[PDB]
Write an enzyme that holds these catalytic residues in place. Structure first.
Site, PDB file in Angstrom:
ATOM      1  N   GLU A   1       0.830  -1.208   0.000  1.00  0.00           N
ATOM      2  CA  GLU A   1       0.000   0.000   0.000  1.00  0.00           C
ATOM      3  C   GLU A   1       0.866   1.260   0.000  1.00  0.00           C
ATOM      4  O   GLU A   1       2.084   1.210   0.188  1.00  0.00           O
ATOM      5  CB  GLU A   1      -0.945   0.035   1.216  1.00  0.00           C
ATOM      6  CG  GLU A   1      -2.365  -0.431   0.920  1.00  0.00           C
ATOM      7  CD  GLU A   1      -3.193   0.615   0.199  1.00  0.00           C
ATOM      8  OE1 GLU A   1      -4.437   0.464   0.137  1.00  0.00           O
ATOM      9  OE2 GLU A   1      -2.612   1.599  -0.312  1.00  0.00           O
TER      10      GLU A   1
ATOM     11  N   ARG B   1      -8.117   3.504  13.004  1.00  0.00           N
ATOM     12  CA  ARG B   1      -6.758   3.656  12.517  1.00  0.00           C
ATOM     13  C   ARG B   1      -6.754   4.658  11.375  1.00  0.00           C
ATOM     14  O   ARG B   1      -7.767   4.866  10.709  1.00  0.00           O
ATOM     15  CB  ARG B   1      -6.196   2.330  12.012  1.00  0.00           C
ATOM     16  CG  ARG B   1      -6.998   1.742  10.867  1.00  0.00           C
ATOM     17  CD  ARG B   1      -6.295   0.542  10.235  1.00  0.00           C
ATOM     18  NE  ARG B   1      -5.003   0.914   9.666  1.00  0.00           N
ATOM     19  CZ  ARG B   1      -4.128   0.033   9.183  1.00  0.00           C
ATOM     20  NH1 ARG B   1      -4.420  -1.267   9.175  1.00  0.00           N
ATOM     21  NH2 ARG B   1      -2.961   0.452   8.704  1.00  0.00           N
TER      22      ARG B   1
ATOM     23  N   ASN C   1      -9.689   6.192   1.637  1.00  0.00           N
ATOM     24  CA  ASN C   1      -8.707   5.711   0.669  1.00  0.00           C
ATOM     25  C   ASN C   1      -8.180   6.807  -0.263  1.00  0.00           C
ATOM     26  O   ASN C   1      -7.841   7.892   0.215  1.00  0.00           O
ATOM     27  CB  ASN C   1      -9.292   4.505  -0.073  1.00  0.00           C
ATOM     28  CG  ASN C   1      -8.599   3.226   0.336  1.00  0.00           C
ATOM     29  OD1 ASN C   1      -7.390   3.228   0.523  1.00  0.00           O
ATOM     30  ND2 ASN C   1      -9.355   2.143   0.517  1.00  0.00           N
TER      31      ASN C   1
ATOM     32  N   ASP D   1      -9.723   1.841  -4.502  1.00  0.00           N
ATOM     33  CA  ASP D   1      -8.808   1.813  -3.367  1.00  0.00           C
ATOM     34  C   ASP D   1      -7.927   3.057  -3.478  1.00  0.00           C
ATOM     35  O   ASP D   1      -8.438   4.164  -3.297  1.00  0.00           O
ATOM     36  CB  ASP D   1      -8.036   0.482  -3.351  1.00  0.00           C
ATOM     37  CG  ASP D   1      -7.395   0.164  -1.986  1.00  0.00           C
ATOM     38  OD1 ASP D   1      -7.085   1.097  -1.216  1.00  0.00           O
ATOM     39  OD2 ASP D   1      -7.194  -1.038  -1.679  1.00  0.00           O
TER      40      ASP D   1
END
Ligand SMILES: [Hg+2]
Ligand SMILES: [Hg+2]
Ligand SMILES: [Mg+2]
Length: 307
Positions: free
Chosen positions: A17, A107, A159, A211
């Site tokens: 990521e 988070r 995202n 994403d």
């Protein structure tokens, strides 16, 4: 068609990521959002390194004006990590701010500097789930005196982010909404307004979930499709226009960043994490990093965070 190369030197990631291309050092940084690790790849020298911490991480961006220091997420804290790029742990950690001190199961997730150097990032439940799960996230930017400002709530999975070249628009993805939104962006006040859908997956029979994303010099968005085995190219000049599709061998494509000496090689991260409700058998889900050439477009160097 475009060439899609698996970067053998880099191995497989649980959830690779947050790719960031530093153009002056020709270096790709990225994270694993489950394994609590940061990663560095120097393609011209075939050099790979990693760094371990004990908190969940989701982005890594060089600190403007401070070689050897990076702005990162550590669970819900935005922090400065002093890292030599090769040792397996940071030299030191300087916390900046905890964005949600009293939300114990949230988070930070995707984050990126806008073209002016302001860090934008969003949160999510650690146990978020698709298509339906707890929706507890918000979108922030880190402003003056190291305080965050909130711009949007009710975000399931915070995202990908991008900004138009003229600084008039921001683009943003909550994966749970299965669409890309566009906003009017006021560069002088760092506020966003007039939220509206730009591209809606169900209108174009695009599977999976948006994403990460990035934007090219022409203004096209390149969007990673998690559980779609692809990246898609979409217009920002007209709503709901699919310009192209590039298949990526890994089904769980997670994010994108332009790199290479001429900023025309698209690095693509993916996730090998095998999920119980997948549309793809486990034998297909690996987590490699890929490089796409021949797209006919150039992107921009990754922007450093200004504090
Ligand atoms: Hg690090
Ligand atoms: Hg780091
Ligand atoms: Mg992501």
């Amino acid at each position: 068609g475009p060439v899609v190369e698996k970067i053998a030197e880099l191995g497989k990631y649980t959830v690779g990521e947050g790719p960031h291309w530093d153009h002056e050092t020709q270096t790709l940084y990225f994270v694993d959002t489950v394994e609590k690790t940061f990663h560095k790849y120097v393609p011209s020298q075939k050099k790979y390194t990693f760094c371990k911490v004990d908190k969940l991480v989701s982005f890594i961006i060089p600190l403007a004006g401070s070689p050897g220091r990076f702005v990162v997420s550590l669970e819900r804290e935005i922090a400065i990590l002093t890292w030599d790029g090769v040792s397996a742990a940071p030299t030191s950690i300087e916390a900046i701010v905890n964005v949600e001190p009293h939300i114990k199961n949230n988070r930070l997730n995707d984050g990126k500097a806008d073209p002016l150097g302001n860090l934008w990032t969003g949160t999510m439940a650690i146990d978020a789930g698709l298509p339906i799960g707890p929706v507890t996230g918000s979108l922030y930017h880190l402003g003056a005196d190291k305080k965050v400002k909130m711009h949007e709530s009710n975000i399931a999975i915070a995202n990908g982010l991008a900004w138009s070249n003229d600084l008039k628009k921001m683009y943003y993805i909550d994966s749970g909404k299965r669409r890309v939104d566009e906003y009017d962006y006021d560069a002088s006040t760092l506020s966003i307004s007039n939220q509206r859908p730009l591209f809606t997956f169900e209108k174009h029979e695009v599977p999976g979930y948006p994403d990460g994303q990035t934007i090219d010099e022409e203004g096209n968005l390149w969007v990673a499709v998690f559980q779609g085995q692809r990246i898609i190219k979409i217009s920002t000049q007209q709503p709901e226009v699919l310009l192209d599709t590039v298949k990526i061998p890994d089904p769980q494509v997670t994010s994108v960043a332009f790199g290479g000496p001429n900023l025309d090689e698209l690095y693509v991260t993916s996730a090998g994490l095998q999920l119980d409700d997948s549309s793809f058998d486990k034998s297909l889900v690996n987590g490699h990093v890929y490089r796409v050439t021949g797209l006919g477009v150039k992107g921009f160097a990754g922007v450093k965070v200004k504090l």
